Amino acid sequence: KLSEHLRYCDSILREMLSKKHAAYAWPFYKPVDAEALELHDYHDIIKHPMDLSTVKRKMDGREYPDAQGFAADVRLMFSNCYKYNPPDHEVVAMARKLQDVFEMRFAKMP
Ligand code: NA
């Protein structure tokens, strides 16, 4: 079983992965494939990649000991995006919209 807090976190993940947010969430569904995206320096710049599929695997694997660890990975995902891309990239705007969802939902955890 997941703790109470982590059951709430699981719901946030479900929401982030849901159709309602897909127009901006889709770049975060799978790990960045540096070769396929021709971003060949990606792993020189980003030392700790993260994406929502990995968060889902970790959740299912009961790897998070608390809600704070879940939040850390999700914030890492957005931060990687802000760090790597120019601030006017369309993907940064998509990250921001999805982060607005995440931060609001996380803060509203009972
Ligand atoms: Na609350």
Numbering used by the authors: 307 to 416
Mind quoting what the paper says about this structure?
Bromodomains (BRDs) are protein interaction modules that specifically recognize ε-N-lysine acetylation motifs, a key event in the reading process of epigenetic marks. The 61 BRDs in the human genome cluster into eight families based on structure/sequence similarity. Despite large sequence variations, all BRD modules share a conserved fold that comprises a left-handed bundle of four α helices (αZ, αA, αB, αC), linked by loop regions of variable length (ZA and BC loops), which line the Kac binding site and determine binding specificity. The four helices form a deep cavity that is extended by the two loop regions (ZA and BC loops), creating a largely hydrophobic Kac binding pocket.
The second BET BRDs bound to tetra-acetyl H4 peptides with about 10-fold weaker affinities, suggesting that the first BRD in BET proteins recognizes the H4 tail. In contrast, the second BRDs of BET BRDs bound either weakly (BRD2), not at all (BRD3), or promiscuously (BRD4) to histone sequences and their variants present in this array. For instance, recurrent t(15;19) chromosomal translocations that result in a fusion protein that comprises both BRD4 or BRD3 and the NUT (nuclear protein in testis) lead to an aggressive form of human squamous carcinoma (French, 2010a; French et al., 2001).
